[PDB]
Design a binder for this molecule. Structure first.
Ligand SMILES: Cc1c(O)ccc2c1CCN(CC(C)C)[C@@H]2c1ccc(/C=C/C(=O)O)cc1
Ligand SMILES: Cc1c(O)ccc2c1CCN(CC(C)C)[C@@H]2c1ccc(/C=C/C(=O)O)cc1
Lengths: 233, 233
């Protein structure tokens, strides 16, 4: 994992990519949005577990630390995937290929249009930077490893060190991609910073969404430690 | 502002630095924590306004955009200052020089120990990286310009462009500092990434704190648009 070259890191991330899923509704029947969005997120989560297990370095950690990282990052990971999928659809969010929604459609749930807006703005930022697919898979892996690393014994000290070494290797990889693309050293650092600073906004979006989900006060909303543990163990 | 050299950028940021404030309690009387923390935050905010006006590029923006940026970033800015001040005090948060609190002291307010923990962990990360004062002022300015830039007309398009150009100049500056310190190009990119990724965790902490403050449901807690506008106008 730490002996991978930049090209090998990229290949491994592209190969791990999950599929794009469809919403489950009868397309021959007349057009609940939260129902549809919950079911889609439930099914994406299963595939996210399989993806995470294929990110280099991730299965080297303890199962408890794998669960902690996924618990912290899962909604950010869903959100970056949505933003990426929606990039060439100005003004719309491509939740699935059969579920392409505008901001007015989010107005149907109290608190949701604000989240829809923030997601559309991130998509439009990605569009303005001309984000590449190889840069997106790197960013997504960085979210997985970084989002829970500050909230965790000799074992833990070793786990945090390894997570930081893996993160350094993905930073190396990003820079390599930008060098292969022909950017100057100045441009390279500038773009790296631009990309990482968007991750702060993705955190914010997830925190805002988590607050909505927690406020629903429902045992079938938000995956528990135990469900994540069962799926990962 | 965009014509500043890296050295000039650093000098200007160091010069803008606000003072460290004291808690207001009678030190001769027996030892409310939330009272003391609110009063301290109220007074720090005034000084933060003056600081922000001295960050290069910031007064070039519209007053409405200055207010939006401060509204989004103020608690993150207080939190990064606390973490920096607390760096050489393992296990304790130096809220002020006369108010140095451990995690057990945070247990006195329902929900606060969790926030205290996250802040102690960030301080300990800064300690492990050996963060330098010149890097800290850069990071703090980056928070100010970045945290509200994705949530904002021809004027706005021009304002977001300028904010991104200012941010690129601070990225250049960071890298220059790390080059002056003797780091390799590889180390330079790696450390830049490490530093920016901590900003995501600072966002998360602020979101968690904002939720506590909003849940107090009090007109004298959280600065309004109008108060920020009055202080900045
Ligand atoms: C990015 C994304 C998806 O790809 C799929 C669903 C949702 C989002 C972001 C917006 N979000 C809605 C936001 C208000 C958070 C959708 C969502 C809806 C329900 C659940 C519930 C999951 C569960 O309860 O286990 C999670 C996310
Ligand atoms: C970093 C920091 C300070 O330097 C000063 C106070 C506080 C923090 C972080 C933790 N925080 C407590 C957290 C629960 C947010 C403190 C705080 C307390 C009250 C207020 C209220 C301000 C207002 O109501 O205008 C703001 C921050």
């Amino acid at each position: 994992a730490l002996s991978l070259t930049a090209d090998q890191m990229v290949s491994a991330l592209l190969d791990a990519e999950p599929p794009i899923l469809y919403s489950e509704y009868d397309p021959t029947r007349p057009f609940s949005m939260m129902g549809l969005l919950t079911n889609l997120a439930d099914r994406e989560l299963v595939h996210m577990i399989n993806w995470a297990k294929r990110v280099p370095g991730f299965v080297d950690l303890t199962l408890h630390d794998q669960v902690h990282l996924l618990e912290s990052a899962w909604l950010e990971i869903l959100m970056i995937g949505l933003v990426w999928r929606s990039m060439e659809h100005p003004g719309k969010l491509l939740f699935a290929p059969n579920l392409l929604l505008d901001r007015n459609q989010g107005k149907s749930v109290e608190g949701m249009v604000e989240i829809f807006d923030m997601l559309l703005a991130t998509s439009s930022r990605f569009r303005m930077m001309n984000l590449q697919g190889e840069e997106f898979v790197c960013l997504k892996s960085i979210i997985l490893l970084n989002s829970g690393v500050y909230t965790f014994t000799l074992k833990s000290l070793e786990e945090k060190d390894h997570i930081h070494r893996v993160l350094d290797k993905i930073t190396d990889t990003l820079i390599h991609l930008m060098a292969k693309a022909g950017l100057t050293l100045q441009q390279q650092h500038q773009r790296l910073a631009q990309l990482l600073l968007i991750l702060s906004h993705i955190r914010h979006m997830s925190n805002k969404g988590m607050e909505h989900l927690y406020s629903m006060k429902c045992k079938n909303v938000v995956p528990s430690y135990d469900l994540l543990l069962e799926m990962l163990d």
